[PDB]
């Protein structure tokens, strides 16, 4: 199985497996199938939300790309192909992370000739429009760097609504937009709807054009609703069926009270094996933070992985009791499901998340609860795709370590994460009267260090062999080596030339690693050595490293529990911030030679329904033999119901 698909620009395309899909019942597979169809119909929605020209530009390049009869080896065509592939990755003409608009690496004359040589019937022309007019429309949008430069703008002294190419507002200023929603809000509403979540705000009166059946985007929403109605007929139980039924109504009415009702039912549906997301969910695509991008995920519970986190959870008190922290900081009584993604769509595709924490409505989270999950097969795909990429070959000090990391690194890294997330933050307590914010700007860095150290100290414990979480007592050394190598050295690849460590998690890792390095130095517990001008991290006593991790854990627990700001500051400023310029440049030059793309995204598997003569389903199969170009072209042909212009 090949986890890697292709690489272009600053992007690498991967694939993921859907483990245990074949173990589901046939009816369960049917429900997954329908939900995945409901997911795939939404792709055009996100494109349009990210820019009113995106569907035209996508469809123009797509018509050129698939019918081109010219020299496909020529640089103009190759750069146009890269551009289109970036548009597919980013669901628009702007960088999926940076928001800046892509720079075409091909000439306008080339595109003009390519467009004119395409059957005009195949171009996304409006009625009565010519190919020349479509180019006059789109070429400034594509080629002029000053036009629609950012998909989301965060700058001051600018009208962020007009300065942002996203398509949630049309002909409305930022002050008009914020005022509309500032006025609509009711402070006294204890169960407030998510004002403005599902509409374009336009001036036509400032009014809302709601995304719903019979409204804006109805061509795609109608298809989503069709497949959801199919899914409704094969629900696993009545709770999940009610979720599906309410979600259909929300799409049919556009009512935001239906959305809250749906979200309440969704949080109550905690038992079902299969779950999904399908809606306008997160609001980061909007510079005002009001409108939500469309996304979808279909999934089923990863039983084995969830069981492992439940083993960790149910032993919370054992880890607390045996902790190396001072007894006065220990909780006397102290008390994370994993899901398998079946398909990704909308703002989860192809660039996706490793965890989902929903719903967003605070009053629903407070009174009814929430679902917070991690996506095990996406995390695993990340890990598997990295094997053999050249990184450990370049930076690991010797072949024994490389062999131990290849064998155990993935397992013990994820286990360390599980310890950090399931127990590390929950462990320990403040002393009476101590302000939780006593560490001020250092609080986040110290708190993440504390949880990481809890995980590091315990990933090495023999208890974990007994508990059947690690297969033998040496496995932890893989995680120990990579944590110290990343903390002292290889995370510098994320720092720009001439800068220091800024982000809290990067700081907490350098903090831990540099402290252990300093404290172990008289016994050469950890060394940094050069061969042929390259630096390597050398670990000489793994047992002493565990003891040092424990000593720093105790010290950091004391800092937090007593509110020791000066202690926090001392640790952060002395260990966590300063970058050695020579090491930084050395690591970057070694890293850039590996040609590793900084961003990843995933293609989906392909599901097929098998029916009999009458059409009764007899099986549902999953396949992985589709690449990036194939899947994008197939989605644009078969899962692309929106008009090119949505006005
Ligand atoms: Cl415009
Ligand atoms: Cl939700
Ligand atoms: Cl490697
Ligand atoms: Zn954390």
Numbering used by the authors: 24 to 227, 230 to 360, 364 to 675
Provide passages from the article that reported this PDB entry.
The wild-type DPP III crystals were obtained only after the initial crystallization conditions with Se-Met labelled Cys-null protein were determined. Out of more than 100 drops prepared using these four conditions, just a few crystals of the wild-type protein grew in the E2 condition of the JCSG+ screen (Molecular Dimensions, Newmarket, UK), while other drops did not yield any crystals. The structure was solved at 2.4 Å resolution using molecular replacement, with the structure of the Cys-null variant as a search model. Both proteins crystallized in space group P3121, with one molecule in the asymmetric unit. By superimposing the wild-type on the Cys-null structures, we confirmed that the replacement of cysteine residues or the incorporation of Se-Met did not change the protein structure (backbone RMSD 0.15 Å). Therefore, only the wild-type structure was considered in further discussion. The coordination of the zinc ion is square pyramidal with two water molecules in the remaining positions. In contrast, in both human and yeast DPP III, zinc exhibits a tetrahedral coordination with a single water molecule that is considered to be important for the generally accepted catalytic mechanism involving water activation by Glu461. It is interesting that in the case of BtDPP III, the corresponding Glu449 does not point toward either of the two zinc-coordinated water molecules. The superimposed protein backbones of ligand-free bacterial and ligand-free human DPP III structures gave rise to an RMSD value of 4.41 Å. Namely, human DPP III is more open than the bacterial enzyme.
DPP III (EC 3.4.14.4; earlier names: dipeptidyl arylamidase III, dipeptidyl aminopeptidase III) is a cytosolic zinc-metallopeptidase of the M49 family. This exopeptidase catalyses the hydrolysis of the penultimate peptide bond of its oligopeptide substrates with unsubstituted N-termini, thereby sequentially removing N-terminal dipeptides. Despite a low sequence identity (17–21%), the overall structure of BtDPP III is very similar to the previously reported crystal structures of human and yeast DPP III and consists of two domains separated by a wide cleft. The catalytic zinc ion is positioned in the lower part of the upper structural domain, coordinated by His448, His453, and Glu476.
